[PDB]
Amino acid sequence: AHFTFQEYGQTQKMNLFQSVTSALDNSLAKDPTAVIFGEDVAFGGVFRCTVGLRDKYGKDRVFNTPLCEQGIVGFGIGIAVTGATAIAEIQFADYIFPAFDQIVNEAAKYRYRSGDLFNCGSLTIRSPWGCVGHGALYHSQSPEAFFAHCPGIKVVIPRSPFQAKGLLLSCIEDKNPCIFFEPKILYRAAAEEVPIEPYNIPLSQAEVIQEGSDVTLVAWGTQVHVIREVASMAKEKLGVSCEVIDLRTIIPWDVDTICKSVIKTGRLLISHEAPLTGGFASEISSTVQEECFLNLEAPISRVCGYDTPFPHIFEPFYIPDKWKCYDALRKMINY
Amino acid sequence: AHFTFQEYGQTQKMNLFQSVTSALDNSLAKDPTAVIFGEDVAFGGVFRCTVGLRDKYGKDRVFNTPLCEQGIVGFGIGIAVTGATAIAEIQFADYIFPAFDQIVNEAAKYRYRSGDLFNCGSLTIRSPWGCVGHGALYHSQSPEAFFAHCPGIKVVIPRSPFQAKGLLLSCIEDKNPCIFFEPKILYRAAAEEVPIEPYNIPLSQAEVIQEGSDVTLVAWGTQVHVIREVASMAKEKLGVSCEVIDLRTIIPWDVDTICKSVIKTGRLLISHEAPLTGGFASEISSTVQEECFLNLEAPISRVCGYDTPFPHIFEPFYIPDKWKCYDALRKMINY
Amino acid sequence: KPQFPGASAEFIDKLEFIQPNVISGIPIYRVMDRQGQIINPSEDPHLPKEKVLKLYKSMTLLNTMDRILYESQRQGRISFYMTNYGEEGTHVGSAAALDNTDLVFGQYREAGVLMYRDYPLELFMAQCYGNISDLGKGRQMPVHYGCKERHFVTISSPLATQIPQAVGAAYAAKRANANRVVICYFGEGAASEGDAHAGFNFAATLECPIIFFCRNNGYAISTPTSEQYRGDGIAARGPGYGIMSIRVDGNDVFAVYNATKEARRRAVAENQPFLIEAMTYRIGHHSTSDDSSAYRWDKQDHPISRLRHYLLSQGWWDEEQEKAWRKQSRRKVMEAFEQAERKPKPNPNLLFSDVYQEMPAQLRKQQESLARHLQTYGEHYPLDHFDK
Amino acid sequence: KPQFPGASAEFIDKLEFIQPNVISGIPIYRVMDRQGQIINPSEDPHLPKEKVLKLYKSMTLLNTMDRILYESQRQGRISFYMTNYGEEGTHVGSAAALDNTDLVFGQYREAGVLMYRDYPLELFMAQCYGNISDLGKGRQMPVHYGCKERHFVTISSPLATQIPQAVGAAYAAKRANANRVVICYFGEGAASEGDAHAGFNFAATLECPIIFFCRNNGYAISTPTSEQYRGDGIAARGPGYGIMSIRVDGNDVFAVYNATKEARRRAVAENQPFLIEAMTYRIGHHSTSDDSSAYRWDKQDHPISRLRHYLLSQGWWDEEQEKAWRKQSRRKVMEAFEQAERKPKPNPNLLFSDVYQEMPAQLRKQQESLARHLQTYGEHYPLDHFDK
């Protein structure tokens, strides 16, 4: 494994897929309009995220669609137009593209273009995301930067079971169409205490998970665990204090939390599995440079996937792992 | 108008649509495999770009497809797989999205994923692009940043009739799938001498169209004319010498030319009609900051469209016009 | 017997390809001839006088508005326009067969549905002018109408995207136990889009109370149907998806009405989709950006003419009434037109709201940036035209 | 007579919806019964002994390879696998009816087509292991096969994307005056995708020599066909697009062969698409990631069994031959397997080439960055497994 995974009433140990099911169960229990649909969701889903829900809530509320992503998203938009909560699943993020027109031209623009006479705010699209060791070109992708250039949608990526359930519930209840990307490598690997009852984590809010004073490290999804480890390597090997931040919401993103951190540390390294060019690290880096020019002691580093498609046998060489991140951090500290 | 428009054998005065037709005519004359197809191309196209070509070359080579962009691009990929030149048209860039999966998952990855046993290098997709005064949400868009995050395609945007014909011919002949975006406001407005016979302008090469020493201004398409004017305003009003660069190719982009300029001037302003967040200015700005940290005298400015859909009645307030650019430049000079 | 899960069928012991019936296609349902005479008494809906006069006055009022707004676009007073010439019968015939609260999704060439639902002239014109009375806040190009009060979902330019949306809204209605149908209008060009295949298949497999209404007017901009498809029009695709399908004379208000009325009744009762393909002819240019003589009814087969002949036969209209109405409708349209032209455009601030329900702080920053910009550089902008 | 440009039809004076024939669907063409007996002498293709033995040996060799590679995946030796159980007849029957240079596009469950075209065991295994012999350079997941020499376009995971591509390749072939057909395989799930509607319509309107070959095996992962569509399978959609269509028993090599042979002959001569829906049953799990007992032939209706009974009736096979071949095919598969396991993986440098034909300078920079990285941190990477 390229990574290691490390108030609210009663809790239970839950892995990431189970925390998704818990969020969905809580949602359907409290919102009689809510339905869940997509490919193979009825028998519990190819990642078990919907197990037991059809039995509990009924075949009219948890159901399979024909195999057509553009249909899935257009269908969910139309449910949400009536005011009903629509929780669409896209089987892998790699297969979200056929729905790109329905998401970007339709869902994102629905409220603006009608002057708020109509909306699809009660739509949420959930989709497994990110590398998985052997997914190759079409079961590995991280498409969040494509969506980040689209005003009108929200894009949210959790790093753990606890974070996943609170962020998913926020997406489901948020009055804007949301894409919730679930890091599939974590579905079984990451497990921790998760409240049985519903709770919310705010959207557009980054989380500083470790305070530090020498450099700011920013990532999201599984890559948060990579940078947490990098912070530990940097402390031990270099005597460098790293502030580790999970961005959580891609758009609209928490500019203030990131800039506040960089004003303090003077250095920033951003990492993501997606390709470098056009990746969302470029948006963060530009903005920070604009806001923290006087504080920046070194060029902002982006440690990302290469500008290639996501390979099968070469995955261990492709990903921005802890050594690539550490080496980049070392150099930036030396600057 | 928010803008003013200002070796190779015999030339003729041509507007931008005519220069496109000239490029296409030259291509079909010299390449017997080449075909042009899409919605309404047979009668000459909704912007007249294909007038006369079906008469000259035949109905098997210049033809209408059914109304289906995902079909248009998949069809063109399959022609290009056989080695034949496929010149697909997408009627407005706003309607490229239904083909996003065929472009990103298929065309861009075709050569890589087959180990070069198959390719679609002889595909070119051309599409009108950019604002037009009253196009509103779906006849105004500039989608180049969506495509910039996709390794394996090239994305090219000309600023004039002469540039359009030489860049289009390069795209048509380039051994990679290319998207050529034609700034539709310029179709009739911009007119200048254009060589009758074919010639090429290199891809991935920016053009410094005016040398300057105080600030670097970068744009592409119609926005080049806006920044050219801004350079003139800055010279007259501020005694500021601007280096004006047309990027031309979005990906792979000419990093060297931009960095060389910023090393000299120490200041950079990038402008584009597309929305700020996730726009391609963020990629340029991050990269320049990484490469020119020691030379940068001021934060890099991005003057872009707002993070909204493209409005109808508010267009004059939405676009990054010459005054918005000038004011941003003024402030950056004051920094 | 065959045991395959994918189909229910017998074996055949000889090789026979199934040929399409394109030359002898699905027949075209007609109720009245081109002289407005009822062909088959048993098909006559016997609509009451007031209703038939409303069908007639709605079509001609739309036609009056079309002529004025088309002229306004030619003069550069509005940026764009698309007329409804030749297709007025499909709009009003079908709208009259719907319940008032049935939800409508459209394409762009269905304004008669709104007119039949009493959408004010003032609001049609407010949208085309993008003025302060536009509830769409001037954000979309002209003819992109929407009315929450009249259950008409805001038009958007991307073709066929509303098809699977309409199906989702129909599924939600089923669940709500609505006694409501959704109708989804689209052209024969739009039917080529992948979203049409998605919507048709979802509607059948998810069992939704929806009417798909295809206006087949022979052209998609310059493209004739011979380059659009090769089977027997759109109606012949319905059965392949398991959808009950019919083809009607779209120039015959009563044929459109009858088919729509029966589809509505059955779609709502049975939770099953129906497809209606209305055959017509696009008399106008495609839009104000189109000169249709570049690539190709009015006098011998027009829905309005046919309806007018019908009224005369019942003794429900005459020359005097026609003249008075021609004048009254001109005056009504001209009054709304003049008002629409004198209204200001909305505050430029409205450029930023409704992107999200709330306004993100970073978006508010951009709005503030514009306000500061206009304070300094305002002389360079058309400010005197915009509210506030 | 109706005058509408969009369809060719008569008027009808009574309202009648067209109902789909789903209970009595398009019949299933069969040539031999489950005991391998020819049902109708006039349909017997009388393939020569050597050819029928090649159909048989190709299926069983594929089946042998499937069992071994499925076990290899269970043990974690390869990352992924998908078997072809129950569908071997569709692959070999159809491939045998094609000309050797007809271009094939596929989905992922068509490896028998390659096996019939003599694709080496070594190369099937090279792709699954991503080793140095893989011409795909280890870049795609297992079973994503492609062979330029054998005119089999590299498989990609996104469903149905190859459908409109196959049509474009078929148009290009027409132009080239090829006497070549394109065949495009896909499952009944993939047929729900918008790309299928695009490809079918383009093929008909642009008049392309293509065979669409749909393997209807009852399920798309967990989803039964009752949740996939509501019309009469995929074959009933063909006529709506103007495509000549047939349904065959996909467990009957000879029925598949005959339909494919006649479609090829006519598609090439007439420049017209043909649709073949082969009814089968997916005997295996969907893939190695699937346990199919979570949501639901082998002994009573299997293509291999049926073909074996046929050979016996001609006196073309016996128990002794079956035993010797079982042994020889096991040995051939095990030899390739052992070789495949001992080969190194390709140079990690190959991660960067073929993204574009040339390597952009900025991409070369990334390749250099990796080389420097591995010089310093190489102990932390599986380097001893990779070439160079």
Ligand SMILES: Cc1ncc(C[n+]2c([C@H](O)CC(C)C)sc(CCOP(=O)(O)OP(=O)(O)O)c2C)c(N)n1
């Ligand atoms: C996905 C996509 N592709 C292409 C188009 C371009 N187009 C149009 C516009 O942009 C419409 C706006 C002005 C409101 S309309 C149009 C022709 C559609 O023809 P149809 O037969 O469906 O409809 P009709 O004959 O009633 O105009 C096309 C190709 C479009 N709007 N959407």
Ligand SMILES: Cc1ncc(C[n+]2c([C@H](O)CC(C)C)sc(CCOP(=O)(O)OP(=O)(O)O)c2C)c(N)n1
């Ligand atoms: C556009 C899209 N959506 C969903 C899928 C997921 N999926 C699959 C994979 O990812 C395949 C890779 C492992 C090679 S296969 C699949 C089921 C396809 O069912 P079909 O009936 O078409 O084919 P078959 O029964 O032969 O498996 C789906 C939903 C997919 N590959 N593409």
Ligand SMILES: [Cl-]
């Ligand atoms: Cl996986």
Ligand SMILES: [Cl-]
């Ligand atoms: Cl335009």
Ligand SMILES: [Cl-]
């Ligand atoms: Cl001015």
Ligand SMILES: [Cl-]
């Ligand atoms: Cl290690």
Ligand SMILES: [K+]
């Ligand atoms: K939501």
Ligand SMILES: [K+]
């Ligand atoms: K090219």
Ligand SMILES: [K+]
């Ligand atoms: K639409």
Ligand SMILES: [K+]
């Ligand atoms: K594919």
Ligand SMILES: [Mn+2]
């Ligand atoms: Mn039409």
Ligand SMILES: [Mn+2]
């Ligand atoms: Mn299947």
